[PDB]
A paper describes a structure:
Superoxide dismutase-1 ([name]) is one of the most abundant human proteins and is an important part of our antioxidant, redox signalling and respiratory control mechanisms. [name] folding, zinc and copper acquisition, and disulphide bond formation can be catalysed by the copper chaperone for [name] ([name]), which forms a transient heterodimeric complex with [name] to facilitate its maturation. Here, we discover the mechanisms that govern [name] maturation and stabilisation through interaction with the chaperone protein [name]. Combinations of mutants yielded crystallographic structures of full-length [name] in two different conformers complexed with [name]; an [name] domain II truncation complexed with [name]; an [name] domain II homodimer structure at higher resolution than previously available (1.55 Å); and the [name] disulphide knock-out mutant used to promote complexation.
Numbering used by the authors:
A (entry chain A): 1 to 153
B (entry chain B): 9 to 82, 84 to 240
């Protein structure tokens, strides 16, 4: 698929819509959109291995990771494929997301379609946290909102 | 139907918990094998029942039970789930399991429906920005005319009808030989307001949508774990 979209929802006030576009085969993926109702600051932003959300993050699996790496930031070479770092919310709680990424794709073995996108509570420490949980989830805390990434027209 | 292996994660510390769990499943209609693992906190269940029912049977005996995996014995060809929902009272969970390269088990439980036949369809896009209205038309890669599950000339997304009982619950389990799990990952599953006439209504929308009225609920067909893939 050439485009994709995700509608992030949660229990709290956090909600958002995220678009994906990939015009080149295995090319960069434009990730743009907006999330509102966040606290001001950096919020972890990750793609999970599965899109099953029948039991929350349990059924969602760990961070999408077909190359069995440890957690890093988007610009790190040692990263999970689903590691898209932090989005930044403004004083009004609005994070305007604008990202380019070539490790994720909308086709092939890094295809993120069918998988859960999550916006997290705290800042993702980008694998540099000095303890085991930093190499797994990046210590971003609990799930504020999520949705399945689907195919768009 | 075909046998399906369900991998449940069930909490059970004592040996008395293992005995309660095994008793609730063993000797029940449509449950071949049970295979409890105390060390791994796991219960494999070979069955022809819906997963929603086998989950209720486990949960009915005290301890909680989450479904973590789905296959058909020993290579996982593809598993998926669609959580139905939106603005109305309709909500449910439908699971897809690719049994063989040419056969797919679709199985689910849906509540909040008016008693009677409701059409069920895989639509082409998984775009929920305008809820079900943004999901596009019935998934039709072959450029076919609309039909029912029995018609070989049908849209690949055509799953016919689903009967809601007097309590508004609609349980079903079916195998489809044209729909493939990884052909529909990221697309949407939609349940409709009324009956799918299966192309046979003589109405302008009969050969397009089956004239089943408004879309009530819909979800994106998401990737889920096969057996032992999510620990
Ligand atoms: Zn990660
Ligand atoms: Zn159709």
């Amino acid at each position: 698929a050439t485009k994709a979209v995700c509608v992030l929802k949660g229990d709290g006030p956090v909600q958002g819509i995220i678009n994906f576009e990939q015009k080149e085969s295995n090319g960069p993926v434009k990730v743009w959109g907006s999330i509102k109702g966040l606290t001001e600051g950096l919020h972890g932003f990750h793609v999970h291995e599965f899109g099953d959300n029948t039991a929350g993050a349990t059924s969602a699996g760990p961070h999408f990771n077909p190359l069995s790496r440890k957690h890093g930031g988007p610009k790190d070479e040692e990263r999970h494929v689903g590691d898209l770092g932090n989005v930044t919310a403004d004083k009004d709680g609005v994070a305007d997301v604008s990202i380019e990424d070539s490790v994720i794709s909308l086709s092939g073995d890094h295809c993120i379609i069918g998988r859960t996108l999550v916006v997290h509570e705290k800042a993702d420490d980008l694998g540099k946290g000095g303890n085991e949980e930093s190499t797994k989830t990046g210590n971003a805390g609990s799930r504020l909102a999520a949705g399945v990434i689907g195919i768009a027209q | 139907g075909t046998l399906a292996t369900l991998e449940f994660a069930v909490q059970m510390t004592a040996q008395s918990a293992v005995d309660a769990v095994r008793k609730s499943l063993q000797g029940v209609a449509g449950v071949q094998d049970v295979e409890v693992h105390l060390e791994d906190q796991m219960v494999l269940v070979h069955t022809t029942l819906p997963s929603q029912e086998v989950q209720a049977l486990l949960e009915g005996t005290g301890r909680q039970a989450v479904l973590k995996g789905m296959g058909s014995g020993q290579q996982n060809l593809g598993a998926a789930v669609a959580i139905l929902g939106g603005p109305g009272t309709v909500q449910g969970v439908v699971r897809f399991l690719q049994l063989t390269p040419e056969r797919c088990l679709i199985e689910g439980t849906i509540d909040g429906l008016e008693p009677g036949l409701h059409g069920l369809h895989v639509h082409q896009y998984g775009d929920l920005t305008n809820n079900c209205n943004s999901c596009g038309n019935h998934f039709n890669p072959d450029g076919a005319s609309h039909g029912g599950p029995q018609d070989s000339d049908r849209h690949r997304g055509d799953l016919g009808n689903v009967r809601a009982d007097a309590d508004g619950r609609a349980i079903f389990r079916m195998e489809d030989e044209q729909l493939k799990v990884w052909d529909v990952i990221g697309r949407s599953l939609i349940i409709d307001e009324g009956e799918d006439d299966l192309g046979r209504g003589g109405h302008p929308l009969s050969k397009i949508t089956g004239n089943s009225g408004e879309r009530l609920a819909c979800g994106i067909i998401a990737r889920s774990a096969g057996l032992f893939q999510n620990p």
